[PDB]
Structures are given as C-alpha cells and as structure tokens.
C-alpha cells in the first residue's frame, strides 16, 4: 500500500488584513508579519526534512510570495511551480475593499457575520461594470463568464476548487510527486472538506492557522490516513483558537 | 508570399551576484544576488513597464541568481501570476574545477595567459571536475533527472551552446511561435548562445559580445523567427557606459 504526503500552507497576514478590509480576490501583498510567517514556514519544513517535487499556488500575490519565500528559505527555488486561479481565496463580492468595522456599523454585525461565516449565503454581488469585477483583469482573460465570480460563498468556493484538485493536483500526487500547495483560508478549507469528508456544520468552524505547514498522509486511493501540523504544538493551538 | 508576423522576445541577464562581488568563478555554483543585483532586477522590471511590455510566459534557469531576478522583475511588474518554466539547460556555462576559486588565485595556479584562454576562447574548456569532487553536479538533488552525459564536469562556450540550443528549438521557440510573449531571465553565456543562434554570429564575434546586466534585450522576430532587429531598453548612453566599462 502506498502512502503519499501532501503539504498545505495558508499565507500569513496580508496588507489588507492589517487594514481591516475585506480582501477576497483583491490582489494585495503580504504585511511584514505575513512575510515573516512565510519564512518561518520554510524554516520548519527545512528543519523537519520535507522535500518537494512540485508546487501549486493561486493567482493572488500574497500566496505566490508566500510560496516563493518558502522555496528561497528551503533552497528549492528551481522546483516547478504551477499557479491557478482555482486556488484563489473566496471572492467577497461587493464587500471587497470595504472596512469590516464600517461595514458592520452600516449593515449590522449579524448580517456581516452571516456573510463571513455562513456556508451557503454569499456576500452581495458585484455588477460586471464594477471596477472590482475580475473580468477586467488581464490575469483572468482565460475565464468564461460562468467562471468569473461576482461573489462567492464557501459553498461556491468549494465548487470552484474541487475540479482543480480532481483534474490536476490529485493526478500529480498519485504520480508520486511530493506536492506543496500555498494558498488561502477558504480554498484550503475546501480541499480539506473534500479530503476528510467534513460536514457543512463542521467546516464553517474549522480555522486553519496561518504560516503552519499542514501535512496530509494519503493512502493509495488518496484517502487520508492521518494529518498533522508541523511546529510547536502549543503555539499552533494558540494560532488555531484565536477566532 | 506569406502573412507577416512580428514576435517580441525579451532577454534579461541577471545582475551582480555575491560571488561576482568576491571575484570568484561561479558557473553552476548556486550563489545568490548581491544588493546591487537585487536592485538591477527591479530596475529591469521598471523599464519594461515604462516601455509598455507585457508577458505571457517566462523561462529561467535552475540557478537562484537568475530565478530571483525573474521573481523580482515579476513582482515589480505586478505579473507574479504568470506561468514560469525553469530549466537547467538555461544554466550559466559550467566553469569546472575553477568554480569557487578566486580569479587571482587561479592566475597563481595556472598563469595569467592560460586563464585568459579559458575565459575568452570559444571551445577550450577549463579544468574538469572529478565525479568525487563535492562540486560535481551529480551530487545535487536538483540534477537527479540528468543523465551522466548531461552532467557537466566543465564547459566551454561551445558546449554551453550545445546544451542551450536544443532547449530553444524544442521548447522556447515553439512557445514564441504560438504568440506567447516570452521573457527569459538567464546568464551571460546562456544568453550568448541564444543570440549566437538567432543572429548567426561567428565564433570570433560571439566571444567579444558582452551583454550588459539588468538591461532588457528585445528581439523582434518575424513569422519564421528570423530576427528583424534587436535593441536594448533604457538610456542608450548609460547602457553603452556599462558595456564599455566591463
Ligand atoms: Cl515561479
């Protein structure tokens, strides 16, 4: 029986996180803390003997830079990297760019909480003529109108991520390539919801810590055997339990 | 008669490396960029933005001084999402048993004249590594896909050309002909090999060609990938200053 190891990294604090703005597909960079966390994740992987053959990341520079920093730290900069929009963060619709506190003062704390934490209720949608509509970005020129999001719930993020796992990433894993994925909270949640068959009720409660390698050991059918976080388990638990 | 095409290919030689600063032969030794090399990569990105260049596909080597140059350029250009292909056939010329040795030390070991022959010849390679030497690339995980014939113990410019051009013909040239706007971030001798082929440059001429670091080099290629013209981007007087003082 085969065992494959898959490693996931959620990027750390972004510039817009620090500024208390909804981000979604807005393409902001990492903050100094996010940059520090990317290097920390690389150092942990190097200390623990992790070696990779192939890396995946999103089209968003906060995840791409996380991967590049990790690879530089691991002296693995020559490795093949595949970037794809299907690993993007959940799209935040017409909330993108807005201050979270002002948005809650305007529309109500509970309504914003629903937009943030519901499985299936999306934030308000963009119109295609909005400056923020992804169809205006050259990076999304290849997307059909059905693929370009105006807003996403976690449910819709799952529907977008899982085809990429099934058609592209999983075959690479089955080939024996040791894969590292650097991506985002909701797209990594989508992946682990599929792998561990997590209920809608449980997945909305799952908080993947930032800057912490998450390792899945998968059997010959890519069914999980076990998973674990790398690092100081006391510090990891604190990262998990903070919101 | 046939339909005219104009393809644009952009080449960037990486800037100063840490071992450049230390006056060491580098070759396939995988050293990083110096602070000046880091700055040059940003400057190249800025000029490409200023001059209106956008890209669809990037190639670089397995050596981090070139990869880092590409990554800095892409960050500067807000093009970090673009597909990147890295391949050892774009590596710098291998300098054999001189790698890591200081240039002044090497003049001691071998004499000024023999060193200049190895530096400036077309097909006289420097002393070769033994496979038991820690510097032999077979020891590196990154090269485990190479055959024994592919692992270099030393290279002349000729052997570098022999290694680069199959990659151009088999991989990069088809991408260019598909219409993908290609950016190549690489090294002095691997970019010499490409331009030797594109412009049909003699051995005598190609050894005198000094591509300036951090300066985008644009080739306009027609529908058959024959060059129409080429030019550097930036302040031409400053570029000539850099070329002249080298
Ligand atoms: Cl890359």
What count of Cα atoms within 13 Å lies in the side-chain half-sphere of residue B160? 34
Per annotation, catalytic residue among A37, A40, A89, A152: A89
A78 closest CB neighbour out of B62, B80, B81: B62
**Distance of alpha carbon B193 from its chain centroid, rounded?**
8
As beta bridge partners, residue B84 has B58
**B14 is a catalytic site residue:** yes
Q: CB of B210 within 8 A of CB of B243?
A: yes
Q: Rounded to whole angstroms, how far apart are CA atoms B221 and B228?
A: 5
Rounded Cα gap, residues A216 and A135, in angstroms: 35
Q: How far is the CA of A151 from the centre of ligand 1 (A)?
A: 28
**Cβ-defined contact of A78 to B71 (cutoff 8 Å):** no
User: Given CB atoms, is B78 within the 8 Å cutoff of chain A?
Assistant: yes
Cβ contacts (< 8 Å) between A80 and chain B: which residues? 85-86
Contact B169, B2 (CB under 8 A): no
CA separation (Å) from B181 to A83, A92, B175, B227? 18, 32, 8, 15
Q: Are A214 and A9 in contact (CB under 8 A)?
A: yes
The C-alpha atoms of residue B6 and residue B223 are separated, in whole angstroms, by 7
Distance, in Å, from the CA atom of A107 to the CA atom of B223, rounded to the nearest integer, reads 58
- Nearest chain A CA: its distance from B237 CA (Å): 34
User: Which domains does chain A show, CATH number per domain?
Assistant: 1-243 (3.40.50.1240)
Structural biology method used: X-ray
Tokens of B94: 């291998």
Partner-chain contact A64 B81, CB within 8 Å:
yes
Q: What residue of B is the nearest CA neighbor of A140?
A: B81
The answer, for B139 touching chain A at a CB cutoff of 8 Å, is no
- Is B142 near chain A, with CB under 8 Å? yes
């Amino acid at each position: 029986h085969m065992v494959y190891k898959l490693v996931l990294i959620r990027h750390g604090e972004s510039e817009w996180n620090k500024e208390n703005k909804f981000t979604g597909w807005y393409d902001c960079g990492l903050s100094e803390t996010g940059l520090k966390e990317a290097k920390e994740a690389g150092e942990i992987l190097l200390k623990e003997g992790y070696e990779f053959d192939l890396c995946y990341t999103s089209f968003l520079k906060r995840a791409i830079k996380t991967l590049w920093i990790a690879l530089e730290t691991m002296d693995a900069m020559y490795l093949p990297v595949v970037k794809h929009w299907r690993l993007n963060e959940r799209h935040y619709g017409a909330l993108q760019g807005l201050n979270k506190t002002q948005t809650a003062e305007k529309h109500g704390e509970e309504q914003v909480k629903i937009w943030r934490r519901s499985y299936d209720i999306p934030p308000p949608a963009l119109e295609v003529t909005d400056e923020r509509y992804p169809g205006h970005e050259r990076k999304y020129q290849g997307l059909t109108q059905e693929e370009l999001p105006k807003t996403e719930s976690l449910k819709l993020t799952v529907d977008r991520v899982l085809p990429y796992w099934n058609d592209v990433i999983a075959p690479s894993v089955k080939e024996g390539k040791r894969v590292l994925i650097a991506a985002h909270g909701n797209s990594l949640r989508a992946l682990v919801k599929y792998l561990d068959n997590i209920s809608e009720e449980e997945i909305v409660e799952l908080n993947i810590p930032t800057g912490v390698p998450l390792v899945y050991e998968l059997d010959e059918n890519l069914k999980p055997i076990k998973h674990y976080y790398l690092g100081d388990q006391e510090l990891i638990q604190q990262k998990i339990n903070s919101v």
